[PDB]
Design a protein around this ligand. Structure first.
Ligand SMILES: O=C(N[C@H](Cc1nc2ccc(F)cc2[nH]1)C(=O)O)c1ccc2ccccc2c1
Length: 113
C-alpha cells in the first residue's frame, strides 16, 4: 500500500447530505434513491464508453473538485471520510469504484496514482 493515493471523484449529494448545497445547486432537493439512481446511470455510461468519468465529474459532481475535473489530488489515510478512504486505497491505479457512501452523499472514485 502506498503512503498516499491520488484520486478523482464524482459526488452526487442528496437532501439528507451533510452540506445539502453545491456549486451547481443552491439547495440539493433530490432523494437518496434518486442520487443512487444517478450514480448507477453514470457507472453504466462509463462502462459502455458513452461518457468520460472526468468529463461527467467536471459538470455534474456536487463537490467543488468538479472545477478540477474531479481531482482531489493526493491524500494519506486519516484525512478523508473513512468509507471514501477505504474505497480509494482498495482500488488499483486506473480503476473505478462502484457506489461509495459518505456523510456528503454518494460517490464514484477513480484512482489515478
Ligand atoms: O469536502 C470537499 N467538498 C465537499 C464534498 C465532498 N467531497 C468529498 C471527497 C471525499 C470525501 F470523503 C467526502 C467529500 N465531500 C463539498 O464541496 O461540499 C472537498 C474535499 C477535498 C477537496 C480536495 C480538492 C479539491 C476539492 C475538495 C473538496
Amino acid at each position: 500500500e502506498p503512503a498516499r493515493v491520488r484520486c478523482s471523484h464524482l459526488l452526487v449529494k442528496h437532501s439528507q447530505s451533510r452540506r445539502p448545497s453545491s456549486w451547481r445547486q443552491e439547495q440539493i432537493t433530490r432523494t437518496q434513491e434518486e442520487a443512487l439512481e444517478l450514480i448507477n446511470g453514470y457507472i453504466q455510461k462509463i462502462k459502455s464508453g458513452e461518457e468520460d468519468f472526468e468529463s461527467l465529474a467536471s459538470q455534474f459532481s456536487d463537490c467543488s473538485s468538479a472545477k478540477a475535473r474531479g481531482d482531489l489530488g493526493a491524500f494519506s489515510r486519516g484525512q478523508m471520510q473513512k468509507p471514501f478512504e477505504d474505497a480509494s486505497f482498495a482500488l488499483r491505479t486506473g480503476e473505478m469504484s462502484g457506489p461509495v457512501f459518505t456523510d456528503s452523499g454518494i460517490h464514484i472514485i477513480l484512482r489515478t496514482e
